[PDB]
Amino acid sequence: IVGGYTCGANTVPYQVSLNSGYHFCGGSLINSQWVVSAAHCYKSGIQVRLGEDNINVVEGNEQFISASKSIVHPSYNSNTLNNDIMLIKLKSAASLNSRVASISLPTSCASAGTQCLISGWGNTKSSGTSYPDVLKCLKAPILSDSSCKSAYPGQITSNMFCAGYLEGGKDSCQGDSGGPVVCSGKLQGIVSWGSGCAQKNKPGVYTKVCNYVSWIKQTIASN
């Protein structure tokens, strides 16, 4: 997150970190046993880390739980990044409370102008690189279809949307992928890709979670 702020400890209680000896992606808790993240963060040997703040220090409210299943979308394309979504099953259910909590799925899509909350332990610099200890936050609006399409000619499918600042200075970045985009209390987006971090006229591009609700529900029910 470039141009964001320190969230505060456990103020984003559905924020997970994905860990295999180190932090490599984020994700969102959607119930006590399942996490949404990016298909492009698929790997083996994933540990889910819940109610983290400082990811380098044990501080008190962490639950470390191994993934027992990672289900990348069947129609995921690595070249286009279309259908960039993955479901992770926890080996055992998380204990849920105020500092570890699931985030609701959308019941409809959100519109252009809506403010959203994007979080993560990704890089904080737009040129050069710098990774934080504690969780970072950013308030950013959804952009019109046309402005998104006009920012990235031919790359925006119907399962993507942009959010951010056309002027630069404020964006998600490397390390934030898999992470949540929360708008009026719903998980609408997933940190996916963009052209640099915080570049003028290159806002971020997020997996449009409202198109996957039924899939998510049915995948969960059958696994």
Partner: peptide, 21 residues
């Protein structure tokens, strides 16, 4: 391909993607 690898939000996953192109 590689430019899109860089677009995904140097780490190993990027390097893999990079190698894979």
């Amino acid at each position: 391909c590689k430019v899109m690898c860089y677009a995904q939000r140097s780490p190993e996953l990027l390097r893999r993607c990079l190698d894979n192109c």
